[PDB]
Amino acid sequence: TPYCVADYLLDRLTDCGADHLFGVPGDYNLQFLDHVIDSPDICWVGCANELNASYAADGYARCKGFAALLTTFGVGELSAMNGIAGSYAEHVPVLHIVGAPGTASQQRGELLHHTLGDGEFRHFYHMSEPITVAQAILTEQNACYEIDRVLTTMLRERRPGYLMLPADVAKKAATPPVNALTLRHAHADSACLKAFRDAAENRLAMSKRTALLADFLVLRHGLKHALQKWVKDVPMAHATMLMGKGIFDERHVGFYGTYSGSASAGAVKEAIEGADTVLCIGTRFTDTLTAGFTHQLTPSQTIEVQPHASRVGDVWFTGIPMLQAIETLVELCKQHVHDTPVPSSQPDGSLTQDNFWKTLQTFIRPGDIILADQGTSAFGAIDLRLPADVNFIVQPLWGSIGYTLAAAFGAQTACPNRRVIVLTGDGAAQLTIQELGSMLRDKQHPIILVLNNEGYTVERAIHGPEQRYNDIALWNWTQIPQALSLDPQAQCWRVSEAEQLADVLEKVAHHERLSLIEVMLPKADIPPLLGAITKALEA
Amino acid sequence: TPYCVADYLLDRLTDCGADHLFGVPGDYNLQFLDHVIDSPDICWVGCANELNASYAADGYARCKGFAALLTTFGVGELSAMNGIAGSYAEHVPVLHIVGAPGTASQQRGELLHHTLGDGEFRHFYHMSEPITVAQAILTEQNACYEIDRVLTTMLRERRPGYLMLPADVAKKAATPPVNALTLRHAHADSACLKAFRDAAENRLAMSKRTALLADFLVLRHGLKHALQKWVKDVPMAHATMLMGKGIFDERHVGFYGTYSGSASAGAVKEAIEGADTVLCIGTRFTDTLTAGFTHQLTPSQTIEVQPHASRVGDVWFTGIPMLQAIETLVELCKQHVHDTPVPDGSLTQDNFWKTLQTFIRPGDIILADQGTSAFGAIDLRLPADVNFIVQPLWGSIGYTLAAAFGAQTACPNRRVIVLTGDGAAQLTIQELGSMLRDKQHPIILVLNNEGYTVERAIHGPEQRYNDIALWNWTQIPQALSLDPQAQCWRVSEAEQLADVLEKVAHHERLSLIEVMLPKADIPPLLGAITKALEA
Ligand SMILES: CC1=C(CCOP(=O)(O)OP(=O)(O)O)S/C(=C(/O)Cc2ccccc2)N1Cc1cnc(C)nc1N
């Protein structure tokens, strides 16, 4: 077994932070899979389908900073395309490796399985172009430097890449690299950085009260600790939006709640929208994050930092790495922001939205990985007051229901020793249910809370509440582990009272087995954030 | 509720033969969905996810000749793209309707949910271009004629189409048409037809024995009855390949078995490959259908008919509808009509398919997935009026279970038999909940050999990447339904399987039969497909 292109790719995977490879086998990638199995550094994780595999890689990358997905030509890669699209939309670096027919077969235009029957082998490569920052068709003549180019581009942009790996190319001789693949930190031209610094200082020097709004690009580019240390060294009002929730210890002084435009709590609206200057760090003001674009933040009121450019008022400064922009603003805030922010300011009976999130509030602990799906789950979890060291995974920009259950399998794989809490609606869990079987096969011990209100009630709040299209098949949730496993190491409960939920949670606190809690909720009940976003449109 | 573009689309859809709409709702398509629900002519079928919905629409179209899928912008449409791709590969006319944000929101480049966060709203429309024969972004200024163009092209090519329907556009005023949407049958230029006819006649006139090989394009273009009457009027050796199986009543004189190249039975190879002239009607010699391209048929041996062109020997004649080409060859064959077609205990692959052989009946809809299922079902000798649905060109496992939901939706009064491996059924399992919700009564046979066993035959039989999570198959219906009313068996002996099949013969409930089979057991064609490739 001489070292070959397959091994070089796998060595580069580990360089990038991936210790696992998710996917589904097929004849076009089996021989590559032999190298994954034999590899001492990469562990193959077979998933129940390719869409779930791509979701799981996404959740994995949100825990480890990088992930990789393996599918087979045509039927595999096209099944995973919604996952890669979501990773592109939310800036998640997942590498899509596609095992493909050998080059000679492709050159001959053979009528092969997993093609459109036209002799064409590049349709699917081209269809992946809009949802990747870099891609390559690997050949004997380009393999190792195209592998390095694509991965390096993914590390810089924190976004998916694509590699088509014909089976014959994977076997071609290669040489183990001596140095690990690392992305050299870019540096702005010092005069260009100076221009942004002076403009930022001039604005901050005249600001009576300055607030800090950080969001998900902070997480993606490895800058969480920089922003926590920022607000510890320079106390001031700070918040995230829904996407970046978990950047901050939300018990710390200066944090008043998550910002969601006009849907924000009063203290948040005053802390953020009331400031003369708001530093927007890695922010994207989406419809869901801003309660239908009802945020009140003007250009002259704001300084914003993006991955490659920063803005002060109306002026953009391009070619500035987000790290240097943040370092500059931290120094300037230390100079001009001198504030002591005002400190921030049991449930029983039938389960409601209100007492559910109140009960869950008392249960979460540092170290938790919390994932919530679109619907009442994510928009109720926004009100959770996260303690330190919480990884909060939500997908509100792409917004694909079913992501959460499969992403939790990936996240638990990345962090076997952390407690994983899955908040999914009954509708959302149906789309990716088969993964739960992957969790049980692998003896994972997540806490899965299925918010069962018997249908799609987000939509009901949006439109046609009694329309039959918002109904679903009613499942027997507590019987699913025993159906998707011959011997599940799981325990299931069905709860309808707040105190039953409290007792159950208490019992599974140390997550010795997989837990599935079917949470009985009213059909029309919606969390406060939804009530303002259902109203957000239609004019 | 004035008649609007949403209604015009629905009226045209039913014109094309679809009485159902599969999909998953989302805020960008809810208002369109109101028109689907209120319409007396189209029935909404909510599916458990968009990939399954696209699979089900595909199966529906293989029964009714047309189908439609509704998804939401971005997350919905991209989840269904493998389904539409398979429909394109195997020439299945599925219309993909995508409910989209209003045009004003799109023109402003808003940071909307289900976008890539860049303000761009045409990425996904463009990614669907290679897997559709026609597509359109519907506007207030083009709506009705783009709907007619796209649907007309689907009818012509029997392939998927795509329409993006912004929410505001759906609500725009429209007028009910007085005529249904129809595709006028194309006619070749008479000189062009004569050239083909002459060449075909001169070649057939010198044939001592002529054989007929028809496949799936016959099914897609509605020519099944034409092919059956052809071989009834002109008896001769005939066969299909795997994709088109079910074109013929396989008990008829002249039929000796399904053609699969060098993997064919000896009598099939002699009947087909031994004839001096072989009529190849709607055939595509894919790797799976020909045992790794080991078919022995020369250009001078063959006359071939494709949708828009036909070939005699080395000469192609383009611009001839396959309907006219078939009618021409039928008449010519009538002019040269000569020769008359002449004449346990433990479950194994062998005794399983023999047991299933005695069970199938006219009227069955039989679906088989890639793996031992499809490569064993090829040896079934089908009776009359059987719809045999297999996907060997695209080859996406999981297709079969979800397609069975669509096929049963199309034909509630026909018996549906699902042949799926344990591995394949895991990819689309949730759709079983849809069958249970809709009170469907298919017979689902899960071939449980505890892993991906076709892969085991290809490469790495002992490698753990060919293993799967072991499910408790007979317990799944009671998990995906509060009142499944389903009949489940686990069988390990041929005689238990025979007994169980008698009990579910009239399919009064949904049945799930978990068939325990050996891990290394391979049906005859699979052993021959993975011996042409192992080289
Ligand atoms: C079906 C659906 C929801 C049912 C939840 O059902 P469920 O799990 O039961 O939750 P809930 O009943 O507690 O509310 S939400 C939803 C959203 O686009 C969420 C949203 C709505 C308005 C504004 C922003 C986001 N879709 C659409 C949708 C469809 N297909 C896929 C792959 N992805 C989606 N997202």
Ligand SMILES: CC1=C(CCOP(=O)(O)OP(=O)(O)O)S/C(=C(/O)Cc2ccccc2)N1Cc1cnc(C)nc1N
């Ligand atoms: C995983 C797999 C099989 C396991 C069956 O497991 P199972 O259901 O259990 O069947 P069985 O063999 O054990 O009876 S087959 C298979 C093929 O590409 C089939 C084939 C290969 C070569 C030539 C012709 C066909 N793949 C690959 C594959 C992966 N992902 C998707 C969406 N689709 C696929 N197709």
Ligand SMILES: [Mg+2]
């Ligand atoms: Mg619900």
Ligand SMILES: [Mg+2]
């Ligand atoms: Mg199997």
